[PDB]
Design a binder for this molecule. Structure first.
Ligand SMILES: CNC(=O)c1nn(C)c2ccc(Nc3nccc(-n4cc(N[C@@H]5CCCNC5)c(C)n4)n3)cc12
Length: 266
């Protein structure tokens, strides 16, 4: 868990700005491993984040190498070279629809795993999906994640910043976060991905988003998004928590649609 700072080499220029994300190298038992390092500018939050990542083991979740306490506290992770999904899609506007389905399906597999593991992500957004390659996505950013109690299917937040545009109505109304509220966020993530990394609910305040949803209104179908994928976004945006599907049902819908698109392409 606790890494050796002399086996860590950090790059001077940051990748992005709880502080900063930098590229580095970690000397392993034989090979050198390229890493992404979250550097704090908060300590207990970083340790809790690390504690969540250490418990997860799935191909569609970012692997934590360890933590290091040096000049600042550091969370060292396996590098996903292509960076955040929203930025990548904004920069690569010609990624095919089949490829977007492939990536969102991978996110749904990682989330099916998280749901099975009884962890709630609480910040599932396209900025929190990282690309290993153009065909391999991993979920990142476990800073708000919670391990659910053995006796409850939700985490109750004590005092409300929150990414409100990705939050289900029960998060807003009752401060209750479950794998079903992660499904709602996944619906917004799908909308972002099929919109090539555009921000959801453009030009609206959080209170205006809440008023829109309460009226039963939902974002429109993005340009070129298949009807089946839009129907799935709408199903993730089921107001009633009990009627909303879980990740097992969402992943199955995506898996079947993806292989329909794969075999039709052949
Ligand atoms: C901000 N810019 C970047 O992250 C970024 N820019 N570029 C050009 C990159 C290239 C590769 C990676 N590769 C990586 N591989 C593994 C883990 C990470 N992580 C990133 C975050 N946070 C940022 C910040 C909060 C929102 N989400 C992402 C966490 C927690 N892990 N990044 C990250 C980036």
């Amino acid at each position: 868990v606790y890494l050796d700072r002399k086996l860590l080499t950090l790059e001077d220029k940051e990748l992005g700005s709880f502080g900063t994300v930098k590229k580095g190298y970690y000397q392993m038992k034989k090979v050198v491993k390229t890493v992404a390092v979250k550097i704090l500018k908060l300590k207990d939050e970083l340790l809790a984040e690390a504690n969540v990542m250490q418990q997860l083991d799935n191909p569609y979740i970012v692997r934590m190498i360890g933590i290091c306490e040096a000049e600042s506290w550091m969370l060292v992770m396996e590098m996903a070279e292509l960076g955040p999904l929203n930025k990548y899609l904004q920069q690569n506007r010609h990624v095919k629809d089949k490829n977007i389905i492939e990536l969102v399906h991978q996110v749904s597999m990682g989330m099916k795993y998280l749901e099975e593991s009884n962890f709630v992500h609480r910040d599932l957004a396209a900025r929190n999906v990282l690309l290993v390659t153009q065909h391999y996505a991993k979920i990142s950013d476990f800073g708000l994640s919670k391990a659910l109690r053995a006796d409850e299917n939700y985490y109750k937040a004590q005092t409300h910043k929150w990414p409100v545009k990705w939050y289900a109505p029960e998060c807003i109304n009752y401060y209750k976060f479950s794998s079903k509220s992660d499904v709602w966020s996944f619906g917004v993530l799908m909308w972002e991905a099929f919109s090539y990394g555009q921000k959801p609910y453009r030009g609206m305040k959080g209170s205006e988003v809440t008023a829109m949803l309460e009226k039963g209104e939902r974002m429109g179908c993005p340009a070129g998004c298949p009807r089946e994928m839009y129907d799935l976004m709408n199903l993730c945006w089921t107001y009633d928590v009990e009627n909303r599907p879980g990740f097992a049902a969402v992943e199955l819908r995506l898996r079947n649609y993806y292989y329909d698109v794969v075999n039709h392409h052949h």
